[PDB]
Amino acid sequence: EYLSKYAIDMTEQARQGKLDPVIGREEEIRSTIRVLARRIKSNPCLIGEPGIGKTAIIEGVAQRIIDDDVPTILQGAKLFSLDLAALTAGAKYKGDFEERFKGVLKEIEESKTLIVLFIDEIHMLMGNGKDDAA
Amino acid sequence: EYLSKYAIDMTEQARQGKLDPVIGREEEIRSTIRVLARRIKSNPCLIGEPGIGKTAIIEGVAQRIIDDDVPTILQGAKLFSLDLAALTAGAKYKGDFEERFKGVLKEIEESKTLIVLFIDEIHMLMGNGKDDAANILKPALSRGQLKVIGATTNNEYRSIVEKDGAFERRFQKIEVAEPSVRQTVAILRGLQPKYEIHHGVRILDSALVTAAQLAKRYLPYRRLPDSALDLVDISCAGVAVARDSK
Amino acid sequence: EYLSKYAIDMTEQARQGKLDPVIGREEEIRSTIRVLARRIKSNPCLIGEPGIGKTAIIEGVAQRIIDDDVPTILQGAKLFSLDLAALTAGAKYKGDFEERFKGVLKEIEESKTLIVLFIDEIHMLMGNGKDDAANILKPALSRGQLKVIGATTNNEYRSIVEKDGAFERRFQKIEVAEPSVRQTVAILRGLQPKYEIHHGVRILDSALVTAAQLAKRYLPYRRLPDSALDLVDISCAGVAVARDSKQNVVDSDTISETAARLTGIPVKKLSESENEKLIHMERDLSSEVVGQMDAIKAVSNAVRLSRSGLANPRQPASFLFLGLSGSGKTELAKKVAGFLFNDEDMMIRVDCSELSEKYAVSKLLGTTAGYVGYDEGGFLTNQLQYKPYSVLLFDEVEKAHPDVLTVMLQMLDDGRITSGQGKTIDCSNCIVIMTSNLGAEFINSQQGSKIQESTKNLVMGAVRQHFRPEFLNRISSIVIFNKLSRKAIHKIVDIRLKEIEERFEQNDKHYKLNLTQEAKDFLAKYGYSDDMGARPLNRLIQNEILNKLALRILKNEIKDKETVNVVLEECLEVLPNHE
Ligand SMILES: Nc1ncnc2c1ncn2[C@@H]1O[C@H](COP(=O)(O)OP(=O)(O)OP(=O)(O)O)[C@@H](O)[C@H]1O
Ligand SMILES: Nc1ncnc2c1ncn2[C@@H]1O[C@H](COP(=O)(O)OP(=O)(O)OP(=O)(O)O)[C@@H](O)[C@H]1O
Ligand SMILES: Nc1ncnc2c1ncn2[C@@H]1O[C@H](COP(=O)(O)OP(=O)(O)OP(=O)(O)O)[C@@H](O)[C@H]1O
């Protein structure tokens, strides 16, 4: 699966106890849950200064998922982070990364329970004139 | 083993000697080591002006490593000087150097004892608009061992972190500075046999002192290790000519 | 016997005298032998600039083997030249490539001594996209001696190492040096009889010296092992060629002149006349440029020094032209090109008018890889690489920012200017003319047309304030052009009127120029706006003569020729009707 190559199963890291706990931040966690629970465009994004726990909050919700302290939509979820490698593995063979990325997204949508994708450094996909953003 | 195609094994050189003695830098070394011995942010930097022993420190720690004069964590560690072609070998085809950088970190990350990189010029990676522009390829894994000692002048440092913002939250600056005049002499003394051998001449101990004092009171634009050493080397070359002339 | 199908026996070639002997390469040869004598890292790699004797060493090795100057350990070996057909003989059938390398890589050790393979171009192995293109057979089998000697360009070595890795670990890199002129000549002497025999001509020993020495000075783009030979072989051919059209190689009359025909550099043509090259220069520059005689002589003399290569090998003729605008600060430069290349348009104009330290160097020298657009060299690199003794003009070099001035510092003293590409130019044989308006503040006092000593110092003051002395100290001469005395103006008016005739395409209408002294004085007197130099003379002519002429032409009041008279500054000259 492309998810095993270009992503990290954050849920599994949480499952293994490898992640630090989120202490409180309930308002932020609840906000991301409500957004994830939306009918359309269910894509929250954490905005703030660096060094304030944004990534930690997402790892936090992963833990809430691990222990089923989330809506049923999220109880069945598996959270993957997106590696920059989807693109940074190279674009020799024009369109190669576009296909790799299209590929993993296909697998994410395709049937296998609710898959949630965390893309750290989301501005990474701005793209030089979009295009690399694709 | 991508690392072996790009980096110099400082440890192997130290194992074989072929290094200058390192003088007075024990504390810079202790600090370097202390940071490397950290649980997470084990990424110290040798920072100052050119010609102040920043790479001397590395030869120094390489030797301390060879002789197990380092903490448990470093006892069996190895160190590699990288930069260079790692960013330019991929002169064609998108993502090629990026693959190398990643491959190197992979090689370092997995199994093969504790490998520490030495970046001689971190500013060269800079993070040229981030967006996978070299320096930016690192941060994801700066917690994942991949210990690295960096190096930069203060102008270069300030330029990097001001433009980046993350490196100054990932790396441990260690001030490296020119020695006192007497310490300079001790350094010159330590390198004295190197110059004497290559030029086939002697250096008076008082010449080492003169070069150290002179540099301090003569060349305001050159830091004492290089400044005094250049006064010594330049002088040695002149003497070697006299030696050859007879 | 794959080797008998795909490779050349280099010791066969040695025994048959098909290879040239080598001189001075003995230590480098010994190095390759000593590497072969190793159990590990037994494969030497000859690395250097293109042409730096890399295969000369190999060809030399073959001879050293048959001559027994090689340890018996290695002497008993045979040498073969491989690759190319070794692979391309197959095509269809996946894996044939391995099958082609495989029996070679077996026969190489099967009883019939050890065969050393020569891959003159190691860099052409590894695989185009890797593709496990039989290159894997080498490392895989490399433990069994299978000794290989190869070579690569310094640039290519870098590529080999980065592309494969294992090759760096398997091969012993060896630097191969470029010989000095003295060493080069020794090489040439060894090969001298080959050329004399091949062409049926003799070569003077001084000619060989000349080729090496001359090449070192005038062929900076080619390494001596080749450059010196190119001059010898080309020259020998030139002798045989002329002879055998419908003797010997002379140091001067053949080689010096040959090199000049090949590279340009008039000074090495050792021309028969410094009258029809220098004397006429002063006369003709003076004929067209009136006044500024001082400048003309300064240039002519600076140019004179380049004759026969007497001028400093690292310094372009160089000038800085100061003075009143309209005094010919750039016109002289064009006329110099007008003389040098017999064509004013051959001057390389450098648009210094447009400079910013952030673009100023890059538009001249271009940039490095990774930047939008390489086509380096807009004004300097792209011209100097092709025109070794061109003349450059910097129109207002004074507008340059220090970065350009730095380029000029190199240009003016050891002009091995480095292009953005990373490759140098070496333009010491060019002529550099630069201009500035700094003296305007003093020369406009009008106190004497010939620059006076007070004025001179004030002007030079400004120059020294503006440019760092480091620049000024590298200029052959700094000349402040003289102002156009009325005396000059009368001569100039005639010249200008003739110039107008000369440029008038197909002169159906042509000037009679019935100037008479009265209109000569009119143009010379009323056009003498001293503080603007001669340029206003042109405006006056356009305003008073050409406009009327054009109108009469449009009205067809003139069929040919061109009547002139003065009708009566209020007279406005006024050209007459015609027909
Ligand atoms: N419960 C928590 N709340 C806030 N921060 C925490 C918490 N637990 C751990 N942290 C630490 O807070 C730090 C903030 O870094 P984090 O990994 O969140 O990066 P960030 O805050 O998203 O900023 P960035 O965008 O530079 O990654 C982390 O280093 C994390 O170890
Ligand atoms: N104890 C020492 N060991 C090694 N080099 C030393 C020592 N003391 C002084 N030096 C001088 O300093 C040089 C390297 O040290 P230093 O870090 O001061 O230079 P640097 O500025 O680090 O180099 P760079 O410009 O790459 O940062 C050596 O080449 C040597 O001349
Ligand atoms: N001494 C002279 N004899 C004949 N014609 C001249 C002389 N000086 C100037 N001229 C004429 O006037 C013009 C001089 O041009 P030139 O550009 O050299 O003036 P300039 O001083 O270069 O202007 P600037 O200093 O701005 O480049 C030319 O077009 C030329 O026809």
From Swiss-Prot, chain A:
Quaternary context: Homohexamer, forming a ring with a central pore. The hexamer is stabilized by high protein concentrations and by ADP or ATP. Oligomerization influences ATP hydrolysis activity at NBD2. Interacts with YDJ1. Interacts (via C-terminal DDLD tetrapeptide) with CNS1, CPR7 and STI1 (via TPR repeats); under respiratory growth conditions.
Domain of life: Eukaryota
PTM sites of type Phosphoserine: S42
Shown chain mapped onto the complete sequence: 165 to 298 of 908
The name this protein goes by in its record: Heat shock protein 104
Upregulating conditions: By heat stress dependent on the heat shock transcription factor HSF1 and the general stress transcription factors MSN2 and MSN4. Expressed at a higher level in respiring cells than in fermenting cells. Expressed in stationary phase cells and spores (at protein level).
Taxonomic placement: Eukaryota, Fungi, Dikarya, Ascomycota, Saccharomycotina
The gene coding this protein: HSP104
Subcellular location: Cytoplasm; Nucleus
Free-text comment on this protein's domains from its UniProt entry: Has 2 AAA ATPase type nucleotide-binding domains (NBDs) per monomer, a low-affinity, high-turnover site (NBD1) and a high-affinity site (NBD2) with a 300-fold slower rate of hydrolysis. There is allosteric regulation between the 2 sites. ATP binding to NBD1 triggers binding of polypeptides and stimulates ATP hydrolysis at NBD2. Nucleotide binding to NBD2 is crucial for oligomerization.
